[PDB]
Amino acid sequence: IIVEGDHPSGAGGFSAALLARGREAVFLRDRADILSLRIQAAKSRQCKT
Amino acid sequence: WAQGREHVVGVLQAELEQCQAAMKALENSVGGRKKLKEVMSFVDKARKGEIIVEGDHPSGAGGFSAALLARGREAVFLRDRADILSLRIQAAKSRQCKT
């Protein structure tokens, strides 16, 4: 999907602040899953040597 | 006086028709009627004391692109000229202008 900047009040079926908060939430999802996956990687037997 | 009265209704309203067709095709060009209404609202706000932009070439202000700002100013002009033209038309058909 894409959107244009004709009306900065509503975009898609979500409000403008609801949107801002979604972007911060996604970035938090991505860095957290990385961080988990890397901790499990640092505790894995594959890194023992 | 009556002749001129009869000829002004025609002449003036022709200058109106050209005016209103341009405004509505401006709406349908910019997008929604309500969207052009919001850029007209923002240019009216900047024209009053309510907001300042400080810019001669404002690229984005209140969420509008450099091309949208121009369309709004245009839209405002056309509004004012159209209201003036209608009102002088009704004035030219008024009872006060018959005499």
Side-chain angles (χ1 to χ4, degrees):
Chain A
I1 197 72
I2 61 108
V3 55
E4 84 276 341
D6 293 357
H7 36 270
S9 67
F14 293 95
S15 42
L18 246 167
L19 277 190
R21 280 156 104 171
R23 311 192 314 259
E24 181 181 358
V26 175
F27 165 59
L28 291 174
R29 180 175 54 81
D30 281 9
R31 173 71 72 111
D33 293 344
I34 298 182
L35 273 173
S36 51
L37 294 181
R38 246 312 137 183
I39 299 175
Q40 168 173 337
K43 304 195 68 186
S44 197
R45 183 141 289 108
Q46 102 156 105
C47 277
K48 165 191 188 198
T49 180
Chain B
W1 188 266
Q3 278 190 30
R5 199 164 171 268
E6 267 199 346
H7 198 224
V8 166
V9 171
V11 176
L12 244 49
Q13 183 142 25
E15 186 71 18
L16 179 61
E17 282 174 356
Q18 178 268 308
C19 199
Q20 289 185 308
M23 160 68 165
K24 195 127 48 230
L26 187 54
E27 313 169 331
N28 295 352
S29 69
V30 172
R33 146 84 62 84
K34 298 102 190 305
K35 298 198 186 168
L36 183 135
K37 226 141 164 203
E38 298 172 352
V39 71
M40 294 192 304
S41 174
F42 173 99
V43 173
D44 271 333
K45 279 160 167 198
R47 208 106 173 282
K48 295 186 233 173
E50 296 189 52
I51 195 71
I52 61 170
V53 322
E54 208 230 348
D56 298 355
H57 287 61
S59 171
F64 298 175
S65 45
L68 244 177
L69 276 305
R71 275 52 187 287
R73 321 190 296 260
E74 286 190 359
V76 190
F77 173 54
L78 299 176
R79 169 171 59 82
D80 302 336
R81 174 70 58 99
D83 286 356
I84 297 179
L85 274 174
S86 58
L87 229 276
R88 302 313 304 169
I89 292 175
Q90 188 171 50
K93 310 176 164 185
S94 152
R95 187 206 294 110
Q96 85 154 155
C97 278
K98 244 194 186 184
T99 183

